[PDB]
Structures are given as structure tokens and as C-alpha cells.
């Protein structure tokens, strides 16, 4: 609950260590304060694309590559970049262009998916977005050895919501 | 067929309200409309061509 708007890339690529693992649920405590999540909590079901945007905020002198993957449910969450790499993924190369927009494809048996969880959703939910280092952050002498990556979420042009309701009442404090 | 309804009068509530809306999905997907309304932030001056230009490096 010590939320920060970013993740940190390091100078080491452990295939066993994700930089982040997000469950693909409009209920993830991870998304709790995004407009997507605040909007979505007033509806019963959603459909369509979710967009995870990463903004590199490190030095211009740094270099690096990330593997961002979406794993549909069924076999549990991947435990190494090697397993993630078996699902939907993209390689993000650092360079002139600052961000990367990763879209998790709507893969589902039903036309729509429930917005919110009743209880907590296990090993379920709808899968996971995991972020891994492919290559480590590299740098020259005189430069910091880690950088912050800003993480945001939005709806894709595909995204739809239906049936307005009210979430369980809460108090921000 | 139909059920058990036999009123002469036109339904007072329109259908989209009296009933659910049967939709049909095509196998190959459908393109979202281009725009959801006219709300937008705009980026201007994005590019070039025109200024106190070509004194400007090559």
C-alpha cells in the first residue's frame, strides 16, 4: 500500500524474477485508482482490450530490453521469463522513443467478462501481465544504475462496459 | 412463435426497454467506430515546415 506510479529496472536480468506481475482483472488492487478501474466499478461486465503503457524515465545514456507478456489462465501464472515467453509477448527496446504501449488481447470463452470480484478470484481472474528484463539495463560510467519506468493503464478502442450498477460503498479513509 | 400476450395496443414502452437487445457477433470481429464522441485534447505543432528556417542544422 506504499504505491508509487512506477517500477524499477535494474542492471540484472534474473529470468526468475518479474519486474511486475499484474492480474488482468479490473479489480486488481494494482488498478484500484486508475480512471479505468474507477469507471469500470459502476458496471457489471466489460469486453475488449486493456492497454498497459510503460514510460522509460531513466537516463538517455541507458540501454536495455524488456519482455512484456500476457498469459491466459488455465496453467497458472508463469514463473520465469522462459514460461512467459510461451504466451503473448512483446520485446521493448530502449532508444529514442520513450514509451511502449502493450495491449492485452481479449481472450475469453464468454463474450463478456464480469467487472468485479465476489470474494477474491484465486489463480483465476483472467490471466497475468508480467514484465521481465531480457537484457539488463546497461550504462556508461557516470550514470545511475537503475531507472524508473512509469506504468499506466487505459481502455483500447475495442473496450466496452455494460449494465450500470453501484460498487460496494467505501470510505477513502 | 410468440408467447402469451394478446394486447392490441402498441407496447407503451419501446422495445429496447421492454426487452433485452439480441445482438449478433461476427466470427471475424468488428471495428470500433473511429470515435466515441467529440471530446478530445489536441496536439498541435507536432511536425514542421515553416520558420526562420534553413539557418537550422543538417
Amino acid at each position: 500500500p506504499n504505491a508509487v506510479p512506477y517500477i524499477e529496472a535494474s542492471n540484472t536480468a534474473v529470468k526468475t524474477q518479474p519486474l511486475a506481475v499484474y492480474q488482468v482483472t479490473l479489480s486488481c488492487s494494482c488498478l484500484a485508482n486508475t480512471f479505468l478501474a474507477a469507471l469500470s466499478r459502476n458496471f457489471a461486465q466489460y469486453r475488449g482490450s486493456l492497454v498497459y503503457t510503460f514510460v522509460f524515465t531513466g537516463t538517455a545514456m541507458m540501454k536495455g530490453k524488456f519482455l512484456i507478456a500476457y498469459t491466459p489462465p488455465g496453467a497458472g501464472k508463469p514463473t520465469s521469463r522462459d514460461q512467459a515467453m510461451q504466451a503473448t509477448y512483446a520485446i521493448w527496446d530502449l532508444g529514442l522513443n520513450s514509451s511502449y504501449s502493450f495491449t492485452v488481447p481479449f481472450i475469453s470463452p464468454t463474450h463478456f467478462r464480469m467487472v468485479g470480484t465476489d470474494q477474491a478470484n484465486i489463480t483465476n481472474v483472467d490471466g497475468w501481465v508480467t514484465v521481465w528484463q531480457l537484457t539488463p539495463l546497461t550504462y556508461p560510467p557516470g550514470c545511475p544504475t537503475s531507472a524508473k519506468i512509469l506504468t499506466m493503464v487505459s481502455a483500447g478502442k475495442d473496450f466496452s462496459l455494460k449494465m450500470p450498477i453501484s460498487p460496494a460503498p467505501w470510505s477513502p479513509q | 412463435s410468440e408467447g402469451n400476450e394478446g394486447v392490441i395496443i402498441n407496447n407503451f414502452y419501446s422495445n429496447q426497454y421492454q426487452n433485452s437487445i439480441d445482438l449478433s457477433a461476427n466470427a471475424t470481429g468488428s471495428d470500433p467506430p473511429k470515435t466515441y464522441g467529440q471530446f478530445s485534447n489536441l496536439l498541435s505543432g507536432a511536425v514542421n515546415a515553416f520558420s526562420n528556417m534553413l539557418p537550422l542544422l543538417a
Binding site: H111, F112, G116, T123, P164, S166, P169 | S1, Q18, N19
Partner: protein, 268 residues
Amino acid sequence: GVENAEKGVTENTDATADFVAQPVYLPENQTKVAFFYDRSSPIGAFAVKSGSLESGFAPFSNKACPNSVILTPGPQFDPAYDQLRPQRLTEIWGNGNEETSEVFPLKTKQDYSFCLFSPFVYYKCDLEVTLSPHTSGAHGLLVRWCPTGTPTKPTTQVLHEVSSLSEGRTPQVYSAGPGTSNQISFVVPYNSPLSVLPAVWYNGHKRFDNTGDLGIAPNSDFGTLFFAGTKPDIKFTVYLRYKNMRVFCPRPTVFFPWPTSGDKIDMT
């Protein structure tokens, strides 16, 4: 007519095939499926808790006459947790639970008629609901309807002196005056995220963990109804009516006991 039933399909006849006869057809429309289910049938009796009109809701049942109801023709309740929120079940509970007990009247809540006769695997429809108070005197009833799969714990009272049922933008219905007819009627849309609903059984689990418990497919109902009101002593009946019913894949119906008696039945 000679035939070969092994093919899995048998040619249909009239008296005309083997004898000197004539066909005797006459039209009727009461056998269409939509027409057949487009009538109301009861699912059970419910109750309201004292002073629910002005306080936090809480699961509770009067005589196995609860507080909330899941909109579904299938069994639900489980008389053993008459004080817990109700749940969908995979069996119907008799009136008593030991030899000397009785099957009727059933304790669980269901559309016994639908259960007794639903020769289809899947169906889709809209649901018309009727609430009927067992009293001809004034009666106040507050209803909250939540679409399937949405928040169903209308437990926090947010406004001082206002029922917690009566909160938000979730559909709420209320009838209470000296000149009402006491009953409430309305029709709800089809909100399952599922394309078509299992009518009897669904051969799968709830999680991919296969924490094995087959029977019911998740979010395969029409939502939950919560009640608050002023006559905590009057019970009311809840009825379901299937609007524009559609059914797919014929399947068998409930077994009927062999008359270890005659060569015919009757009634009751």
C-alpha cells in the same frame, strides 16, 4: 410399417400407412415452447426482517422464509443456513431429513414445475417477477435487484436512517401506501455473461483449479433480490414468468414412479 430403428431416426406415420384411414390433424398453438413457459409459477415464500426499512440489511429468514432470493428456476436455500445468504444448490431438500420425515412441502426454493418438466439442456429468456404479500391490509415492501455477478452484500448502511438496500444507483423498487394493491411486478433483462444458460446441469467446475464440484455454471442466474419492508410478520410469495423463452437440445425429464398399483395413474 416395417422400419429399422437402429439408424437413430424413425419415419413418422399416421393411421394411413398400414390401414384404410385418413389423417386427423387440427391446429393448435399451445404447444409452442414460448407460450408454454409464458405463465407465472411460484418459487417459495419470503420474509422481511424487523425494521429493515431503516437499517443495515442482514441475511435472515423467518420460517425458512428468507430475506433475499436468487432469480433462478433451480433449487437454492439449504434450510441448514436459513440465516446465511442463500445459495444455489444441486439437489432439492425434502421437508424433513429423516425417514419419518416428509417430502412435501419442500424446504428449498425452486420452480418445482420447471424442474419437473424442462426437456432442454440450455435456454435463454427474460424474467418477469411478481411479489405477492399474503395480506389484504397495508404492506410496505422495498426491493433491491442486483444483476448477476455484481455486488450482493448490501450490508453497509451509508445514510443515517435509510435502509442499506436503498443505496446507490442499483435498481430499487418500493410500494407502500394505504391505496396500493400491495403486489409488485416488473421484468428484468437477461444479464448472464453466458450466451445461453444450463437448464438442469452444467458438467464443469467453478475454478480452473478443478476444486471439483460440478453442477452449476457461474453467473448463470438472473440476479439476486433483497427485501426490506414494514410487515415483518407477513410473508409473500415470489413468482417467475419466462418471457420469450428459447430452448436448445432436447434431453430427458424427471422420472415418474411406477404405479405399483394399477395400469394407470390420476392425480395427486
